[PDB]
UniProtKB/Swiss-Prot annotation, chains A, B:
Subcellular location: Mitochondrion inner membrane
Keyword annotations from UniProtKB, A to Z: ATP-binding, Ion transport, Iron, Iron transport, Membrane, Mitochondrion, Mitochondrion inner membrane, Nucleotide-binding, Transit peptide, Transmembrane, Transmembrane helix, Transport
Name of the protein in its database record: ABC transporter B family member 25, mitochondrial
Gene (UniProt): ABCB25
Taxonomic path: Eukaryota, Viridiplantae, Streptophyta, Embryophyta, Tracheophyta
Covered range of the whole protein: 117 to 716 of 728
Protein species of origin: Arabidopsis thaliana (Mouse-ear cress)
Membrane topology category: Multi-pass membrane protein
Residue stretches spanning the membrane: 28-48, 61-81, 148-168, 173-193, 256-276, 292-312
A GO term for molecular function: ATP binding
Length: 589, 589
């Protein structure tokens, strides 16, 4: 199909690079080795003919091409024929393997580079645990398929060419017709069975992927199932999915088998018809002069790839589907594309203004209806209010994760839409909604703030976050492995790692999502004071509905149902008897 | 080796079940089909002999076994020979495929059932993202290997048996010796190359697994890399790992190739030696009576599996290693094993006492040094203090996730060590440290409290958690997909889902890890009041260093560095000027 053509074109483009002529040299050498090996294979039965007819003569020598006396040397060379055939087949794989592995490396490189380019609207909801499975299966699929494609499929047509070349001796005058008819009928039957089996297999792969997703989700949420003693429930669900895959595979496997019977009988008759015509001519052309052996031989060397084609068909219908799935991954469109006239941003001072911004995560429901406020340079603002009002969304747009529906965003009198992403993102620092850590050292995960920083910068950074007091009690200094998702550490430790990451970068704009979420009063008061003198540039935004941590901020904004309701400093805001007054009089108690 | 023997024994035990004699019937039928097909294959060249010698006679008939006139019918039956060989080979796969898929289902069943049985000390730190990869690769490995094992390896020895049976005609009197020598030398060479390549491949698989782990960790922490603009860093690290795997594969692949040359030359000489001895006897025994054709034929049918053995060797050395890795997963020991005299627990009232408990997560560092307190039945306790004092550990032991080093745990005058796990775990309910949700509906994830509950119980449960107010604003009622880890919801929503899960179960013992972590003052005050009248049995434990949420609890305990320092009710505790007084006077401000 056209999709297969595009896949082949992309594969050929990735394989063939014009920078290095040494690659073309390798390809030409591999082709030469293939041609030599197949020529030797065709030569084998032809040279075996002289042994047979010489024995028939023994039962003079018209041909002078013979330089021997006893046919034993002929049989020695007959063995040497397959020896050399293997030898030339040997060197072909060695040359092609390097370029095959280079292609694998380049493809995996491109896929990994491309995946992080996509948007949160993909990676947040349409990331079903198993993109790793797709990449792993496809990467293994590519090497197998291209290794299969060159090593056995390509030489088969060339052997067909030589068996169609055997007509020069007046033998194959019809054998060419029979072989062409058999090949065409076999190809038609194979494609018909293949389309039918793809029709019956589309349900198989769909069922298979869901079971792995269920298993990976069960592994990820192991704590909950251990809490609620419901292991049998995931057990039964995985059983049902596996039974569905069982039925799908069993139905297909019997039908996949039937092709092997069809392939064998068609080509058995092809050899049978070759026997019949050879039997018809009782005259000397095709009786007892060896041509029966080559016809048994040469058309059987065409039957050598028959063993591959029937046997490897099970994975061909499976891996190629996974190939298209993984290649389909390299055609998605980045939702957030920078403007054509991309221009870097330079700020004399961080001033942020909203001009009636509207955003909806889904088109039907609009979370926020009108937001307009200004962030003075040299000061800071706090965002407090009831939950569910999208107050972490308001800081998910300044980083251009999503694009607003109808509104304007201004930083230092510059358009966020117009400015470059790299200048935008590297100038503003954030602490995430739920802290996530790498599977490496705590020192590496705290040094991630600026990858070119020094150890003393890291050590002084931990002093600002006041974690050396806990560090001195470490069992391993700056080397405790923190697990898969920072689980090994505590809540306060996980939250204090992210803050140190932000301070190490020391960005121009601060963006705090959770401050003092899981910290005691003494630590949080120290962090806030440590976050005022240092670690905070002249612009910073806090979203924290704890009242004591929004005391220090210059401006307080109240968000309810997406409308920015009440504004003002703390002293006036308490006397207004607004939502802020209700919230504060409760926490103060 | 012995490990291979144990793997084979386990595989045979899983495959062979004695409950159903129909399985034994299927196995016997498959063996009969195999024997018939191979007998037909051996018959092919033997019946082809009569065609050759009859033509030599044409160049009377001593044997009366012939019932034909023209050799065309002999050639028709000659084609029918491979037709029937394929036909019997056809039915063998159909019968064996069902039991193969049943074995796959049972093995995956057992692995999934066994994985959730292990402990947190495994699933929390030694779970490197990729257990799913191991299971997926092994499950695919089993079907391929056992499909290969029966279909081609087993018939090869049987063809060796018949080619050693051809001696009855005084032909193979030495051919048996040559074939046995060739087989033995080939096996010795194959095992030597295989052990060398396993030595060179142990580094390959080790390098391969690390790259996939890096990729999966990068995918999991996508938000952090997007925050910090360090995509090139993971790019370079994945490049380095892929280069290491590249070198490991390239070094092995050239050496893996060399075996194919060695296998071919040894068996080419075996056929060559068969030619030589046949050439020595110019007398009628082995000249121009067809035996050259069978010797070319019969020993080549032994060379039919040669094509498999060389070609499929690449995955045999790979999948079998993955087989052992996945089977090694079903031998780990559960760290927490219930006592032999397992007895269910029945509580008249929840009374919890600690008797000088000591626990260390790692042997070197002891987090807590002596904990002893009593939980009165009908009342509740609050655990407040500075972070890092293991206050979520103190509730990770009542659920018997780990075992204490030196101490006693008592519930209603019963030993936690002695009582049964299922009675223990199903009687106490907990809310997790970091909320984790399934990849299903919000209704399913809130109904997970009691899987046999009704919708009205779920709907009234959401009323207790006061989430219908947000539910009425849902875009889809009780059906919004919540993503991979509940990411699509907000923090307050994620925390309020877990609480509803706990209330739906309505356990005998309440165990709250984070209460009002990401909730405003108005919601938290409502939840606490909604958690006093209902949803709380007579025993409950709160760990929350927020002062306003520990006001209602009867008893307050202060934990610092693992020592339970200060105890007492709120009114007396404030006047003691302890750590609690310092913490409260700050939050109150
Ligand atoms: N990925 C998403 N898909 C659909 N709705 C979302 C998504 N992320 C957030 N929301 C909606 O936004 C509201 C709150 O947004 P957010 O700022 O993320 O949480 P919070 O307001 O607690 O900070 C919620 O009511 C939720 O329905
Ligand atoms: N899996 C683990 N491996 C090593 N140490 C741990 C692990 N889990 C917890 N700890 C240690 O326990 C202390 C706090 O325990 P925990 O109760 O989990 O957190 P918190 O005290 O914040 O509730 C931390 O100092 C941490 O070093
Ligand atoms: O659930 V919140 O609106 O406090 O991020
Ligand atoms: O970091 V904590 O000791 O408040 O769970
Ligand atoms: Mg904690
Ligand atoms: Mg939130």
């Amino acid at each position: 199909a056209m999709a297969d053509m595009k896949i082949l074109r992309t594969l050929a483009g990735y394989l063939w690079m014009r920078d290095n002529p040494e690659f073309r040299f390798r390809v030409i050498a591999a082709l030469g080795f293939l041609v030599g090996a197949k020529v030797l294979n065709v030569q084998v039965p032809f040279l075996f003919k002289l042994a047979v007819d010489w024995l028939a003569s023994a039962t003079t020598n018209p041909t002078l091409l013979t330089v021997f006396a006893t046919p034993a040397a002929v049989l020695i060379g007959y063995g040497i024929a397959r020896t050399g055939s293997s030898a030339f087949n040997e060197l072909r794989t060695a040359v092609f393997s390097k370029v095959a592995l280079r292609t694998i490396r380049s493809v995996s490189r491109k896929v990994f580079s491309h995946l992080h380019d996509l948007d949160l609207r993909y990676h947040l909801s349409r990331e079903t645990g198993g993109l790793n499975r797709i990449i792993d299966r496809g990467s293994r699929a590519i090497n197998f398929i291209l290794s299969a494609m060159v090593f056995n499929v390509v030489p088969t047509i060339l052997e067909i060419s030589m068996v169609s070349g055997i007509l020069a001796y007046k033998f194959g005058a019809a054998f060419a017709w029979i072989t062409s008819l058999s090949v065409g009928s076999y190809i038609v039957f194979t494609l018909a069975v293949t389309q039918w089996r793809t029709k019956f297999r589309k349900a198989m792969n769909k069922a298979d992927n869901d079971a792995s997703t269920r298993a990976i989700d069960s592994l990820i949420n192991y704590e909950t199932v251990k809490y609620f003693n419901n292991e049998g429930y995931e057990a039964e669900k995985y059983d049902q999915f596996l039974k569905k895959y069982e039925d799908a595979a069993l139905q297909t496997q019997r039908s996949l088998a039937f092709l092997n019977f069809g392939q064998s009988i068609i080509f058995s008759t092809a050899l049978s018809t070759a026997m019949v015509l050879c039997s018809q001519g009782i005259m000397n052309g095709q009786m007892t002069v060896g041509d029966l052996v080559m016809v048994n031989g040469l058309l059987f060397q065409l039957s050598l790839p028959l063993n591959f084609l029937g046997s490897v068909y099970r994975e061909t219908i499976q891996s190629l589907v996974d190939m298209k799935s993984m290649f389909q991954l390299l055609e998605e469109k980045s939702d957030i594309t920078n403007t054509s006239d991309a221009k870097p941003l330079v700020l004399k001072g961080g001033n942020i203004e909203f001009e009636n911004v509207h955003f909806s995560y889904l088109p039907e429901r609009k979370i926020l209806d009108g937001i307009s406020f200004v962030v003075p340079a040299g000061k800071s603002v706090a965002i407090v209010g009831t939950s569910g009002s999208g107050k972490s969304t308001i800081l998910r747009m300044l980083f251009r994760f999503f694009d607003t529906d109808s509104g304007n965003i201004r930083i230092d009198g510059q358009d966020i839409k117009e400015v470059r992403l790299d200048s935008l993102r590297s100038s503003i620092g954030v602490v995430p909604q739920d802290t996530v850590l790498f599977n490496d050292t705590i020192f590496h995960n705290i040094h991630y703030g600026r990858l070119s920083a020094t150890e003393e910068e890291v050590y002084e950074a931990a002093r600002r976050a006041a974690i050396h007091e806990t560090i001195s009690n470490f069992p391993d200094k700056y080397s405790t492995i923190v697990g898969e998702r920072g689980l090994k550490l505590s809540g306060g430790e996980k939250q204090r790692v992210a803050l140190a990451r932000t301070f190490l970068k020391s960005p121009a704009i601060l963006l705090c999502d959770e401050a003092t979420s899981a910290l005691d009063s003494t630590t949080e008061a120290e962090i806030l004071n440590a976050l005022k003198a240092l670690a905070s540039n002249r612009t910073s935004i806090f979203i924290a509905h704890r009242l004591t941590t929004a005391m220090q901020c210059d401006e307080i904004v109240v968000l309810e149902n997406g409308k920015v309701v009440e504004q003002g400093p703390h002293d006036e805001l308490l006397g207004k008897s607004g939502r802020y007054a209700q919230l504060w009089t409760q926490q103060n108690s």
